[PDB]
């Protein structure tokens, strides 16, 4: 719609020049010569003086899009660090220590019995 | 971009004084601006839809933040 309103202005101006200069152009009377076409230009300007202000709001609205997407990236950029530390967290913990529990504790208990057991077959090696 | 056209329109409405050896400024003014219309960020889509897209993605941003509060 906006582009159409401009080709009218050029065409109206172009035709207006021809019949103010070419004296033989009286027979070929078309747009850009009467007072009705001038009124049409005013209405086109009015319509053209409304569609820009609507678009100016659109550009500002689109700007609010980028800031939100940046927050989405920030809210999702830390996730890559979140997933990195979860695998680290699992590896830090000694899992299934029950095997070491029943093994080490059984050796400890009795500590007073193992010492006495090893005091009677000592020097067991060559 | 967009604020400039309103200035371009203002300039184009205050030209074409008389008829003599003249400068084709009105011809270069509709072409210069016509490029500005082709470069407007937002005429490609309706304004209401863009605003609706803002809240829809704010819903997830809010939801992620709200679900980031139960995270604590």
């Amino acid at each position: 719609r906006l582009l159409s309103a401009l080709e009218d202005l050029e065409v109206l101006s172009r035709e207006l020049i021809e019949m103010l200069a070419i004296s033989r152009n009286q027979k070929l009377l078309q747009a850009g010569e009467e007072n009705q076409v001038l009124e049409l230009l005013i209405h086109r300007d009015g319509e053209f003086q409304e569609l820009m202000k609507l678009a100016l709001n659109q550009g500002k609205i689109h700007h609010e899009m980028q800031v939100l997407e940046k927050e989405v990236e920030k809210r999702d950029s830390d996730i890559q660090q979140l997933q990195k530390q979860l695998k680290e967290a699992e590896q830090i913990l000694a899992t299934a220590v029950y095997q070491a529990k029943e093994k080490l504790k059984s050796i400890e208990k009795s500590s007073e019995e193992i010492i006495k057991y090893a005091h009677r077959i000592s020097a067991s090696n060559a | 971009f967009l604020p400039l056209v309103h200035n371009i329109i203002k300039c184009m409405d205050k030209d074409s004084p008389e008829v003599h050896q003249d400068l084709n400024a009105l011809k270069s003014k509709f072409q210069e601006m016509r490029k500005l219309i082709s470069t407007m960020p937002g005429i490609h889509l309706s304004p209401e839809q863009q605003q609706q897209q803002l809240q829809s993605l704010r819903e997830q941003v809010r939801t992620k933040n709200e679900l980031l509060q139960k995270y604590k």
């Binding site: 920030k74 830390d78 660090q81 530390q85 967290a89 | 995270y71 604590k72």
Partner: peptide
């Protein structure tokens, strides 16, 4: 545990 809690409260 403190780093995660700090991580929980902070952006990093």
């Amino acid at each position: 545990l403190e780093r995660v809690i700090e991580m929980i409260q902070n952006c990093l």
